[PDB]
Ligand SMILES: *[C@@H]1O[C@H](CO)[C@@H](O[C@@H]2O[C@H](CO)[C@@H](O)[C@H](O)[C@H]2NC(C)=O)[C@H](O)[C@H]1NC(C)=O
Ligand SMILES: *[C@@H]1O[C@H](CO)[C@@H](O[C@@H]2O[C@H](CO)[C@@H](O)[C@H](O)[C@H]2NC(C)=O)[C@H](O)[C@H]1NC(C)=O
Ligand SMILES: *[C@@H]1O[C@H](CO)[C@@H](O)[C@H](O)[C@H]1NC(C)=O
């Protein structure tokens with residue numbers, strides 16, 4: 001009884017083609033990029049992936065910003081708790097505000 | 100500029116464009132190792148200055164990140180920070196002192 005604009009676009013010759021990569025294949029690429037970053041770091045962007053523990057490659061990344069790596073190993077639990085709280089706050093911000 | 104660690108590049112002229120030849124560095128042959136963040140020695144924690152601690156099953160070395168080059172762990176390539184009661188994964192190994200054979204001789 002209530003006709004939408006899609007049928008008017010449809011009957012007047014205006015169609016929409018589907019994308020080549022569906023939303024499931026984008027998530028597989030995203031999962032591959034996530035599992036390569038966590039388990040290997042930046043070594044999967046150059047050649048083959050080289051495994052390294054996460055608490056050691058974060059000490060690799062404090063050395064990039066000018067902080068010695070004892071700061072991580074003496075404050076590992078605090079940084080882990082701060083990251084978990086940041087991810088929880090990101091969840092709350094995305095589930096609260098739609099703008 | 101290329102896949103890997105960039106080294107150089109060379110330009111070549113083309114019709115209505117340019118062509119770059121990016122020379123890069125790609126690691127080739129890999130081996131598994133046993134690693135540790137720090138070493139407990141005489142109640143002290145030793146962290147590597149530049150490199151990573153690895154082991155070949157029995158002994159412990161220090162090795163640069165992008166190439167395998169094991170060295171004997173001394174006080175020249177390590178620095179001390181804190182104690183052994185705060186680092187997760189700290190192992191027990193000795194650290195060589197270069198002044199001891201000079202003082203003994
Ligand atoms: C650096 O800042 C952090 C805040 O992220 C401090 O961590 C908090 O410390 C208080 C101490 O009373 C605890 O009650 C909180 O639970 C801690 N927050 C956590 C674990 O997320 C940290 O103490 C500060 N470092 C200092 C003051 O040396
Ligand atoms: C791990 O590496 C060390 C250092 O190269 C090896 O220790 C030496 O091995 C050679 C060859 O067997 C011996 O001749 C030496 O006497 C060893 N000691 C020293 C102080 O040089 C060790 O054998 C290696 N272990 C494994 C499992 O490969
Ligand atoms: C290291 O160990 C893993 C464990 O399964 C194995 O698959 C791999 O072939 C080993 N070697 C390298 C170079 O990763």
Ligand SMILES: *[C@@H]1O[C@H](CO)[C@@H](O)[C@H](O)[C@H]1NC(C)=O
Nearest residue numbers: 139141142183189190191192
């Ligand atoms: C290293 O040695 C200390 C005593 O010198 C001991 O308490 C500790 O358990 C040892 N580390 C491991 C991993 O066994």
